[PDB]
A = this chain, B = another copy of it.
Amino acid sequence: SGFRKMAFPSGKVEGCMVQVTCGTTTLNGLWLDDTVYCPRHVICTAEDMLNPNYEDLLIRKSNHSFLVQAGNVQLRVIGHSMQNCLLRLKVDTSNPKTPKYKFVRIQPGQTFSVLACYNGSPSGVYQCAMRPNHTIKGSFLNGSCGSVGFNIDYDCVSFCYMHHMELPTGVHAGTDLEGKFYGPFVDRQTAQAAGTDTTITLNVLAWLYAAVINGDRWFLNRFTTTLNDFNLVAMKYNYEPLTQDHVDILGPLSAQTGIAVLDMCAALKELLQNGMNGRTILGSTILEDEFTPFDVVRQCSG
């Protein structure tokens, strides 16, 4: 019952947040075992951000060029390397609080928790989704960089995102724990259109099923709609095209609630076209798409 944009317990991720400083640049880092990840752009001098040559800027650095700090104790960096847009600083001590973890490049539309950090210190956690344009509509300020995006599968933390940029659109862009950006962005402060955004159709349906699982039903109709017709409409409303895989995914949620995916699609279509009569769905006044089908099934069943 009830429905919140729920984030995973950030506890296990906090125990891996550290401060990493190079020159006068300081940002967050992930310290797992004997390694610390952070946006390689930490080595970027001010003026060096217009068009930095990381390979060049890094070679001019050394282990001691990095001031990695765990809380208030200085971590000794005894090895460093670059992996795409990351810095993999090896340290001498191994973080005893390193949770069971895995690095995963999430798929646009998927959701994850973000531990907003500043100076290697957890400031807040929020759940967000990998927007369709690969950016993340988040709340980040200067110094949030190095914050990690993660998921928790029981006790195994899946790091999927590491903050890096701030597209002018006000959104945010980062990398996966392997340094590869999400979207067509780069470690440069150079014009970067935060690509055409779309509404995650998959999630809005998952969300609508959630509202239904929770008793709300007013938006349903006797109408139905082919996958193709739903798309012809949805796309007009700037919605991600809905694929058969998506409806397969909504399968479970379809069963429970007993509503056929396209029927729900028929409801979504109506909503899009008739607006919400001012009325609300599961609280919101606008179709929510930051809850994946998996999220919903996890927050409604048990």
In the complex, what residues of B have CB within 8 A of residue A62's CB?
A: none
The answer to whether A125 and B10 touch across the interface, beta carbons within 8 angstroms, is yes
The distance in angstroms between the C-alpha atoms of A141 and B296, with both chains bound, is 12
Residues of chain B lying within 8 A (CB to CB) of residue A127 = 126
Does the CB pair A5–B126 fall under 8 Å?
A: yes
Task: Provide 7 A-B residue pairs closer than 8 Å at the C-beta atoms, listed in order of the A residue.
Answer: A1-B166, A2-B139, A5-B5, A6-B125, A7-B125, A10-B125, A11-B14
Provide the residues of chain B in CB contact with A215, threshold 8 Å: 170
CB of A70, distance to nearest CB on chain B (Å): 14
Minimum Cβ distance to chain B for residue A15 (Å)? 7
CB distance A124 to B1 under 8 Å?
Answer: no
Most buried by B among A116, A118, A126, A215: A126
Does A140 make an interface contact (CB < 8 A)? Answer: yes
Chain A residues 209 to 228 lying within 8 A of chain B, measured CB to CB, are 214-215
A123 in contact (CB, < 8 A): yes
Question: Chain A interface (Cβ within 8 Å of chain B)?
Answer: 1-12, 14-15, 115-116, 118, 122-128, 137-143, 166, 170-172, 214-215, 283, 285-286, 298-302
| Copies of this protein chain in the complex | 2
CA distance A15 to B9 in the complex (A): 11
Question: A16 to chain B: closest CB distance in Å?
Answer: 10
Chain B: minimal CB distance from A214 (Å): 7
Q: Which of B6, B137, B141, B302 contacts A126 (CB 8 A)?
A: B6
Given contacts A1-B166, A142-B302, A286-B285, is CB(A9)–CB(B124) below 8 Å?
A: yes
Closest chain B CB from A221 CB (angstroms): 23
Q: Is the CB of B171 within 8 A of A298?
A: no
Q: Are A9 and B10 in contact (CB under 8 A)?
A: yes
Contacting residues, chain B, for A125 (C-beta < 8 A): 6-10, 125
Residues of chain B within 8 A of A7, CB atoms compared? 7, 124-126
In contact, A170 and B4 (Cβ under 8 angstroms): no
Known A4-B139, A138-B4; contact A11-B122, beta-carbon cutoff 8 A:
yes
| Shortest distance from the beta carbon of A188 to any chain B beta carbon, whole Å | 18
User: Which residues of chain B are near A122, meaning CB under 8 Å?
Assistant: 9, 11
A139 with B299: in contact, given A4-B128, A5-B5 (CB under 8 Å)? yes
Taking A4-B124, A4-B139, A11-B15 as known contacts, 6 extra A-B pairs with beta carbons closer than 8 A to each other, sorted by chain A number, are A7-B126, A9-B11, A9-B14, A9-B123, A11-B122, A139-B299
Q: How far is the CB of A10 from chain B (nearest CB, A)?
A: 4
Q: How many whole Å from A176's CB to the nearest CB in chain B?
A: 20
